[PDB]
Design a protein around this ligand. Structure first.
Ligand SMILES: Nc1ncnc2c1ncn2[C@@H]1O[C@H](COP(=O)(O)O)[C@@H](O)[C@H]1O
Ligand SMILES: Nc1ncnc2c1ncn2[C@@H]1O[C@H](COP(=O)(O)O)[C@@H](O)[C@H]1O
Ligand SMILES: Nc1ncnc2c1ncn2[C@@H]1O[C@H](COP(=O)(O)O)[C@@H](O)[C@H]1O
Ligand SMILES: Nc1ncnc2c1ncn2[C@@H]1O[C@H](COP(=O)(O)O)[C@@H](O)[C@H]1O
Lengths: 341, 341, 341, 341
């Protein structure tokens, strides 16, 4: 069966594996290897215990065999024997011998086309960058929109940011119905590792500042991303992220100018249909009176709070929550399940 | 002097007094009484120490002259004797005998023209409701914009909300020079007192949940304010508000369609000229990459982040800060100062 | 099957009803009625949606009849039909009708014998205050310790606090082993409902203060309870509490003077043999480097951090974690099961 | 006059420079040089805008004379003309050319005896390690206790930690009245720079975990340091530290067995006395019911909460707050203004 490997057992990598076991439907593929620069013990711990998502529900047993290290993981009536590796520089990795079909490059270090091929130079067949693009990419995918539009000879694939997978669907759907003259996105976002616990030295003089005590307006790769997905949107959309002191779950505030005429009802109605039809696998809509932590550990790439939708004249605004760790995790998985086809 | 009194030594009332002593120019009106349902010591204790604004910078001793309790408040080369009262029902309050010129109603219970007038029956000359009008006000005022338009016959007046103080100048300033077709607002606001520390039974099931580790979107009455202030802007602007774990400071995220050519440079250039000339008292602008905490205890009704301004086509977004409690409190005083003809 | 009411559908009351379901051990009794000032719809929201413990996993069918309201609740293959009520005064409540074998008085408003007797007046056969007593109680129980001391005759009982549920084991185990001359307790508790979001008027001027941004030391009627439980430990034990801005999970820090030889190993080993034999049902011990978050939703009365134990001479210090809501909520049930005719 | 320089312009470094300006008493020495690996601009911004301590009241103007970068800071009727340096290797520093009498080491990378000496070999005339000793130093000092015992043979001087600056004067005062058989310290501390914002890989696995959402029991160098100043205390004192989600201000829970009769009264009475006589510059005491943010920006090396003092038999406990950035930093300034003839 298709063999997958994770480079970087960070938040993303860890949650991905967690998802594999937690996934309601067993993914046909299997993860057989994880690479990192840290000791296995540290990782296991972080995989086992998490402040956000909680104790991982199942045993994890390390075994040394020959000289190779292995995570025997069991959970949800499902096993994986993973091989651990401690190679800093990808190029030397043994993806060749392991017959690794798909690398999940989740280190955030090797985002470029050059640094991503290093995994292919190392004998892997297909890389997926678990972040926005840096320079070149053979395709910029958003499972639920253009996961089909992957050529087979594509090798360096990006699946963009968590933010981008809430934005792209909102935009596509609405442009396809009402038209979008120009849009503007505010993103209310939980904290991210990039920030500092206390005022520290940081390039981002904004993210320099105490994560827990500040509202921090900053930027989002998610615009430049979506412009690679919908190159026509170049010079029509913009926006930014705001960081506030919650641990997890984020929102989008999408203001836009419709080209056809719009009512509140109408916009909400469309988004409800869309969530039951084409985008059923990654969208959901809620009227109920909810707040971020209700959407924690929610595998949708976005949920629309419909009550939040507003309209004055041509101008409108919609609101979507999304677990900014866990949606984007199941989308790295859901995409890998699309390649067997 | 012209004599002012406070009803409700709440988060506002206390800050108003603090501001009276902390303001760089002394006001030509004394605060001669306060009144609250809570014990004097509790009030004093919270007058002296504040989690958001640290210690009060001076002395407070409690005299019992006659049968009457008194506060004796020594700070920044200024003194006040201040009679404490403890009457729920504001019609009993002896504003008559104390010869109160102006009340500030700062409890939140008495916002109807009806309820508020009870201070005038108690023998007050004038009342300011420190809150968006409940039903009617002889006028509704935002210092720096329309404060002038108070007539002598005007008896019940509202100083609206912190949001209103920052949302209105932005509209007047932009709408005049550029022309707002429609505009939408997103208010990122710190925790509010009416919230719940853990999840709790409450009318609003959004503002029922854990204030400190939860994002909660909800309503802003600073729209239903703005419309009494600017009648022209009815159906041209709606918006909503978001609670986030910080303890103070808030942001307005204004997003508007223009009836003219708009560049980022030209928007910011206006907002600057407006702060330099027409609104130098209640406005300011910052080029610097600052965050919420940096504007704590800032007296300006709005500080505009110019590196947050954004243009796509005829649509745009401006970004302004304000200390909710302080920005609003200094405007309260600035107002009572203005009635001296 | 006995029949159990819950005056008070707050953190405790609600998490009681949950644990009944989420528990793998099935209780021979059933919960058949709840009461609260709030209206059914609101209780149901909050029963389903919790910030701390997350989405309730089950369906909740609100049934209205000619006057009576019910709650059909389905989860973990278990089904309850639960009458809802809205009556402030527990004297008038119809426990008579419904054959209430036990009330769980989880409001924290009826803690005297007289106020709790209002439930016996209403027709309930037996009460239990879900707090420390306020005066007379026909016993004060800590499950796993003196739950068999329940006299048949005993009507009004108390189940002390979560804090006391943890302190007492420790004391009893150590004293009955090494002998405790005197011992002091430092409790690090997460925010609680009594606390305020911002500085508000309150009788306890420690708890008046903004809960999110303050280390707030204070009282703890765990001691006053521990004395009612272990009478011989009068005068020898005192302690206090500290509120810090986590949402949940507390820790207890007991420094004691032993009346015999003590060494870290022996201290820990003792607690290990306890968590393995006698107290093994409400106790557990962990060698691992954990933090508060990971014990969130843990059913144990105490979990001892054995890496934290220290000894200098005849004085030593042990350390335990506990979930304040869930630890307590499970024990309440366990005690109800203890009452078997 | 003596000429001070700062290696490491971090939390400590920058607060040190700030304190210089704020002190009512113009110190009899000037800070003439700072050094950081980071870029000047960042260093200014952070020195100007702080989340913990607010805006620096003054103005900084960067000047590049010749090929040297200077900082012209003006505040509180004073000016310093600083030089900024980008030299990571201390041996290569120009302390000799700058005629530096005192380097403040605050990088926390050069705590070792050898490494700190690297400064002296650069022409430094005396070095102060702004941390507990790593290996062994010429002398460990606690201003207000033993700041007189400095010899001119002493060139490597450790100012211990913000914690030790409060632990020592308690222990000293208490042993030297009632005696201390043994004693155990619990420390509740605000968050530190070294913690992670989200769960993360790090050497210590408890400081790996999310700073804003956990109580985190860990360790404290303060005992190791106190023994190098009170060697008699070896074997007679231990303790640990806990990190809670607050920005600043920490407290200490000293529990101790007395060697005489003690009553709560006498203990508080001694500490009141001590705070007026000998330890009057570095100590204070409060009867009031106060909380962390009350003592933010408070230059006392400790303050006792006397309401918190407890007694059972020979065992007693006390409690004291301290600003763990501000206090420590004025002690650095107080230590440098001892050395003057
Ligand atoms: N050169 C590298 N090769 C492989 N994994 C790496 C490398 N550098 C960092 N990592 C991992 O990438 C992750 C960093 O992302 P995060 O920890 O989520 O901020 C951690 O799991 C690191 O161990
Ligand atoms: N009937 C009343 N008359 C005057 N002040 C009141 C009354 N009821 C409550 N207050 C005060 O109004 C304020 C409302 O809460 P807050 O403004 O958030 O502090 C508090 O100071 C209350 O103690
Ligand atoms: N008179 C009452 N009878 C029954 N339950 C009550 C009464 N008053 C308040 N409660 C409930 O008790 C709860 C207090 O516990 P907590 O939610 O932890 O603050 C409130 O949320 C109410 O739902
Ligand atoms: N010579 C130096 N070598 C290494 N780090 C330095 C040096 N000078 C300044 N720094 C940095 O200054 C920072 C200030 O401390 P902090 O920001 O609290 O970690 C430290 O992180 C150091 O790395």
């Amino acid at each position: 069966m298709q063999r997958i490997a994770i480079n970087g057992f960070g938040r993303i990598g860890r949650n991905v594996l967690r998802a594999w076991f937690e996934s309601p439907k067993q993914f046909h593929f299997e993860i057989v290897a994880i690479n990192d620069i840290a000791d296995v013990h540290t990782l296991v711990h972080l995989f086992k215990y998490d402040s956000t998502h909680g104790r991982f529900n199942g045993k994890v047993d390390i075994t040394i065999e020959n000289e190779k290290i292995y995570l025997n993981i069991q959970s949800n009536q499902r096993l994986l024997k993973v091989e651990v590796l401690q190679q800093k520089q990808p190029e030397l990795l043994p993806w060749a011998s392991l017959k690794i079909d798909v690398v999940l490059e989740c280190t955030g270090l090797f985002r470029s086309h050059a640094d991503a091929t290093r995994h292919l130079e190392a004998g892997a067949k297909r890389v997926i960058i678990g972040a926005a693009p840096f320079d070149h990419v053979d395709a910029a995918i958003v499972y639920g929109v253009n996961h089909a539009d992957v050529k087979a000879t594509d090798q360096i694939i990006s699946s963009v940011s968590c933010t981008t997978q809430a934005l792209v669907p909102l935009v596509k759907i609405i442009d396809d119905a009402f038209g979008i003259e120009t849009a503007l996105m505010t993103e209310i976002h939980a904290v991210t590792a990039d920030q500092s616990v206390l005022d520290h030295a940081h390039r981002d003089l904004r993210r320099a500042r105490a994560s827990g005590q500040n509202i921090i307006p900053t930027t989002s790769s998610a615009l430049g991303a979506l412009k690679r997905v919908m190159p026509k949107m170049e010079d029509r959309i913009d926006g930014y992220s705001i960081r506030v002191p919650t641990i997890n779950v984020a929102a989008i505030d999408l203001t836009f100018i419709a080209q056809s005429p719009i009512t509140v009802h109408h916009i909400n109605e469309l988004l409800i249909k869309a969530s039951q039809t084409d985008y059923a696998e990654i969208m959901a809509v809620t009227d109920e009176p909810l707040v971020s932590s209700d959407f924690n550990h929610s595998p949708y790439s976005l949920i629309v709070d419909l009550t939040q939708t507003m309209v004055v004249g041509h101008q409108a605004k919609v609101f979507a929550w999304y677990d900014n760790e866990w949606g984007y995790a199941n989308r790295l998985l859901d995409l890998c399940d699309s390649f067997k086809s």
